[PDB]
Amino acid sequence: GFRKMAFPSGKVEGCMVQVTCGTTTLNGLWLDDTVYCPRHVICTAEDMLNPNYEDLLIRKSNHSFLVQAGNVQLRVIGHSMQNCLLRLKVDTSNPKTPKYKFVRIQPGQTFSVLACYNGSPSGVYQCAMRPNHTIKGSFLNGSCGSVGFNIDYDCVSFCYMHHMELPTGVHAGTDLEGKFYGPFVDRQTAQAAGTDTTITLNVLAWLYAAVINGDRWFLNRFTTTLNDFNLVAMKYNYEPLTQDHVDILGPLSAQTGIAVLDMCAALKELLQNGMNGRTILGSTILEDEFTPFDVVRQC
Amino acid sequence: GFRKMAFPSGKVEGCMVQVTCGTTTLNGLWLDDTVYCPRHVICTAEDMLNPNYEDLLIRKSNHSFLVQAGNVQLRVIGHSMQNCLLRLKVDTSNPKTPKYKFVRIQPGQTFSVLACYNGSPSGVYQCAMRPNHTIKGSFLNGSCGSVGFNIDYDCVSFCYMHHMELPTGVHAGTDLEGKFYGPFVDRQTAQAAGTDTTITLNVLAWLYAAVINGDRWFLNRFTTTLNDFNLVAMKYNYEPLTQDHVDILGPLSAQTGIAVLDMCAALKELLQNGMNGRTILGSTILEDEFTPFDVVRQC
Ligand SMILES: COc1cccc2[nH]c(C(=O)N[C@@H](CC(C)C)C(=O)N[C@@H](C[C@@H]3CCNC3=O)C(=O)COP(=O)(O)O)cc12
Ligand SMILES: COc1cccc2[nH]c(C(=O)N[C@@H](CC(C)C)C(=O)N[C@@H](C[C@@H]3CCNC3=O)C(=O)COP(=O)(O)O)cc12
């Protein structure tokens, strides 16, 4: 019964709008009297090679932006730029605005994406911020402005806004203060992601889940120090494990009676010898987007 | 990128309530002026072993039901049993009632589940009705009354309400008329489902999904007959393929350009020789919980 789950999306659906600037349309996020969207909405295809966004913006007026919340048209009172985001002040304050916060997600953590097209929600799914600051998403044309989030209690933490697809098929975007994750820039360019690495904390959580499921062929009685495990991990493009990660795994360690460093010695052997066709939780590939929190929450 | 995706759950979240009867609480679905929930809310531990629900319900009155829609308590005006569901009439009609229908879904079809606890939505995910009429869901204690659904245009098709977990960890429940899917009954007894099989139609749709987005490595130049493929299907516990199924795969066959019986030959090879450590859509197993409809909508 281990599956990826998304947070319920209703609180975010109530904030999704459409923003149109001439020929280009995309999604924006309506909280109180401000609408947030990618700033490349003001761009033409010609402007996309090397845009001067401050120039492009001064040449726009409030009336240049068509903002539609479903049926209603909203009147843009003012506009400003915040990093790679446009902030549109609007006539009307969103009655559906939830309690919210803007957070910067860290590599390895997960969030739900509400994929939207023309301001209309289309689907929800879970994904993770990769170590190389991309996300392996599902985005078609028209998805820019779609938002990633977590929900704790009744408060929505917005963490991601979609901007771009890279030639490798992965996706890039910003936090809700308009700062890109990673070295990417909002212009058509030859940019490519760094070498991705595997989220070791999450592979270890997945192995604990596999043991909880009654799968423990990979266990052994070797010992490893944290330092010696980290040296092998990096050879195989796995992220090194920090002290904090070891403590994050404490609850799963106690539930299974497998010491964290002993699970690390199990993983070290999988890296060095491969699986030899055997499966773990049905797969020959080590899953790395299930967090320790996901495992404990589903037991 | 190709992921399992759930419908946005906003329209369903507005319908979720909490129903308590003595010391037992679960989720209910509030549409217009009636609340639907599993009838075993009226049960105790001793009753759950072999209950007579007609007897237990004649002994209750409207006062015996506390229905909470967030902060507000709704007053129960009437009550009746419909198969394995209770129907509670309440004085207030739900203003957030969407356009909706009750549908009984067929084996092989998919839907989203809004997993709820104490009337509070907790997560959303996609799953399928298995050929043996169970679902492989993620349901913890307190999730009874959680609902499965699809959305088309603005209309919510409710198809599932959650009732129980089988010893194997799969889940069983009813349609919104209260009739169980499968051979199960709502008593605290150990119950077996029939032997499951793989949903062939869905594996084929997913192979088309792989061709549309990305890899064709598993394709070959051969062909098979419907009858000769089904001979391979039975040996591997796959559902036999019919002509109607082939008619369904028409549009996917046209967009990709691979005839349906050619894709069957590719599948027969994958079953006979395994995947030799290769991956098809980031997966090392043949995924069978995407319908043809799901693939087209996501492309
Ligand atoms: C030379 O240029 C390229 C070369 C090779 C690969 C490339 N990839 C991207 C990109 O990733 N994204 C943006 C614009 C870039 C130029 C800033 C886009 O082009 N379309 C989508 C998002 C995309 C669409 C499919 N999946 C997505 O994530 C929007 O949502 C907003 O753009 P639209 O208003 O719909 O045109 C540009 C690019
Ligand atoms: C000894 O008998 C058994 C043997 C072997 C397997 C068994 N399985 C069940 C079962 O599932 N029983 C229903 C109660 C009815 C059908 C009689 C139930 O327990 N449902 C849970 C949700 C479940 C809990 C964990 N995952 C879920 O899906 C509630 O949430 C409501 O119960 P509570 O309100 O929490 O007390 C009984 C049983």
Side-chain angles (χ1 to χ4, degrees), chain A residues 1-45 51-55 57-62 64-65 67 69-70 72 76-88 90-98 100 102-135 137-140 142-151 155-178 180-187 190-234 236-296 298-299, chain B residues 1-45 51-62 64-65 67-70 72 74 76-88 90-98 100 102-140 142-151 155-187 189-212 214-220 222-225 227 229-231 233 236-243 245-246 248-254 256-261 263-267 270-275 277 279-286 288-299:
Chain A
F2 285 122
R3 52 170 57 249
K4 315 203 146 142
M5 326 218 281
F7 284 103
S9 59
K11 279 172 178 70
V12 179
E13 293 169 49
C15 305
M16 296 311 305
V17 301
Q18 203 188 19
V19 177
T20 301
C21 214
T23 175
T24 42
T25 61
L26 43 68
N27 314 280
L29 182 73
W30 185 25
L31 306 163
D32 308 306
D33 50 357
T34 166
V35 161
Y36 304 78
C37 65
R39 72 182 171 163
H40 64 62
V41 67
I42 72 189
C43 285
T44 60
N52 186 330
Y53 279 102
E54 277 87 4
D55 286 0
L57 187 57
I58 205 182
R59 307 196 171 112
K60 297 259 153 312
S61 70
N62 289 348
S64 325
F65 300 92
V67 174
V72 202
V76 174
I77 287 184
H79 63 286
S80 66
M81 176 169 296
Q82 179 182 25
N83 301 294
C84 299
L85 281 203
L86 187 94
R87 301 174 47 114
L88 301 183
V90 290
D91 213 10
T92 320
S93 178
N94 187 349
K96 287 154 135 187
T97 312
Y100 71 96
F102 287 168
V103 76
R104 191 149 174 100
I105 201 95
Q106 285 311 283
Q109 319 184 110
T110 58
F111 58 97
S112 301
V113 170
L114 182 62
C116 292
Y117 298 93
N118 313 118
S120 173
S122 154
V124 202
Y125 55 90
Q126 190 234 59
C127 60
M129 180 58 64
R130 311 289 311 163
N132 75 345
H133 311 107
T134 66
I135 77 187
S138 196
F139 291 121
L140 304 157
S143 51
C144 302
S146 294
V147 157
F149 60 101
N150 289 292
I151 306 191
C155 180
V156 188
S157 296
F158 293 103
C159 59
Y160 181 79
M161 183 166 268
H162 181 49
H163 280 70
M164 164 181 348
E165 174 159 320
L166 302 176
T168 166
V170 302
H171 304 99
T174 68
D175 57 33
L176 266 299
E177 276 163 16
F180 261 93
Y181 295 103
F184 310 109
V185 297
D186 52 355
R187 71 190 79 146
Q191 42 197 333
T195 285
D196 199 14
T197 49
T198 297
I199 303 162
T200 305
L201 204 234
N202 293 345
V203 173
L204 285 169
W206 179 248
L207 296 175
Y208 275 115
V211 160
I212 290 160
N213 216 230
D215 211 3
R216 49 165 86 207
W217 64 266
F218 44 85
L219 298 179
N220 63 50
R221 306 166 63 242
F222 303 126
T223 59
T224 193
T225 68
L226 185 57
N227 184 57
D228 283 353
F229 174 79
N230 282 345
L231 290 159
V232 174
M234 292 186 78
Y236 292 89
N237 279 322
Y238 270 55
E239 288 286 311
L241 206 60
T242 69
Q243 304 106 308
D244 307 27
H245 296 166
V246 168
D247 296 325
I248 283 165
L249 292 173
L252 290 172
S253 190
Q255 174 170 344
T256 64
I258 306 285
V260 177
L261 287 177
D262 281 342
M263 198 67 248
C264 286
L267 175 54
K268 189 198 289 192
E269 289 307 292
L270 293 173
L271 299 173
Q272 296 176 325
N273 304 335
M275 313 266 289
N276 313 353
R278 275 206 86 145
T279 59
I280 291 166
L281 282 163
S283 179
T284 68
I285 286 200
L286 298 181
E287 167 74 46
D288 87 332
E289 301 204 346
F290 262 113
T291 65
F293 169 88
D294 296 324
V295 184
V296 317
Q298 304 179 25
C299 306
Chain B
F2 192 88
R3 304 186 127 138
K4 292 237 177 45
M5 286 189 17
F7 288 105
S9 50
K11 286 170 167 61
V12 177
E13 293 170 58
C15 301
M16 297 311 299
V17 300
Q18 169 177 207
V19 180
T20 297
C21 212
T23 87
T24 88
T25 281
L26 42 62
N27 307 288
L29 185 69
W30 178 26
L31 306 161
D32 302 313
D33 66 337
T34 133
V35 170
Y36 305 80
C37 75
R39 66 179 178 174
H40 72 262
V41 64
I42 71 181
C43 272
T44 78
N52 196 302
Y53 285 99
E54 298 264 85
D55 268 324
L56 298 183
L57 185 66
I58 197 56
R59 298 173 178 149
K60 302 237 172 280
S61 205
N62 301 346
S64 325
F65 300 104
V67 175
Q68 284 154 239
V72 182
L74 311 165
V76 181
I77 305 320
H79 72 281
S80 63
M81 186 167 281
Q82 190 193 357
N83 298 315
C84 304
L85 290 192
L86 283 205
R87 290 170 65 123
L88 312 171
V90 285
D91 57 47
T92 325
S93 179
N94 181 2
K96 287 135 101 184
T97 302
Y100 76 89
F102 292 169
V103 59
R104 187 158 175 98
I105 50 102
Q106 299 297 312
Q109 292 304 285
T110 57
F111 53 101
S112 301
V113 167
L114 179 66
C116 282
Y117 298 88
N118 303 111
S120 196
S122 170
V124 55
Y125 53 88
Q126 191 79 353
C127 63
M129 175 68 61
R130 297 311 303 178
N132 70 356
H133 314 106
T134 66
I135 67 169
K136 319 195 166 90
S138 174
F139 294 114
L140 295 159
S143 60
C144 277
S146 292
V147 153
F149 63 93
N150 290 282
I151 301 182
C155 184
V156 180
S157 290
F158 295 103
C159 54
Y160 178 80
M161 178 166 280
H162 178 53
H163 280 70
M164 42 175 291
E165 192 177 281
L166 299 184
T168 59
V170 293
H171 301 96
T174 72
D175 60 20
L176 269 290
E177 307 289 336
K179 182 184 193 206
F180 259 91
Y181 294 98
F184 316 106
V185 299
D186 47 348
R187 59 191 289 191
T189 193
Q191 308 180 48
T195 309
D196 208 18
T197 66
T198 305
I199 309 153
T200 311
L201 213 214
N202 289 3
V203 179
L204 288 165
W206 178 72
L207 292 176
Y208 279 107
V211 166
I212 298 172
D215 38 359
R216 320 161 47 99
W217 67 263
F218 50 83
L219 296 183
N220 65 19
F222 307 90
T223 309
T224 184
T225 325
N227 324 84
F229 167 85
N230 284 316
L231 282 182
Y236 290 88
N237 203 26
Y238 270 57
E239 289 195 311
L241 188 82
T242 78
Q243 250 301 321
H245 292 166
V246 182
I248 294 164
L249 291 173
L252 285 177
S253 197
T256 59
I258 298 136
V260 169
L261 295 146
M263 194 63 83
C264 282
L267 174 52
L270 285 166
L271 283 171
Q272 290 180 326
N273 282 262
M275 298 187 40
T279 206
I280 283 192
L281 266 170
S283 156
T284 66
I285 39 77
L286 310 178
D288 82 339
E289 297 206 346
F290 297 98
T291 70
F293 189 105
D294 299 340
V295 168
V296 161
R297 140 169 60 235
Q298 200 177 143
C299 309

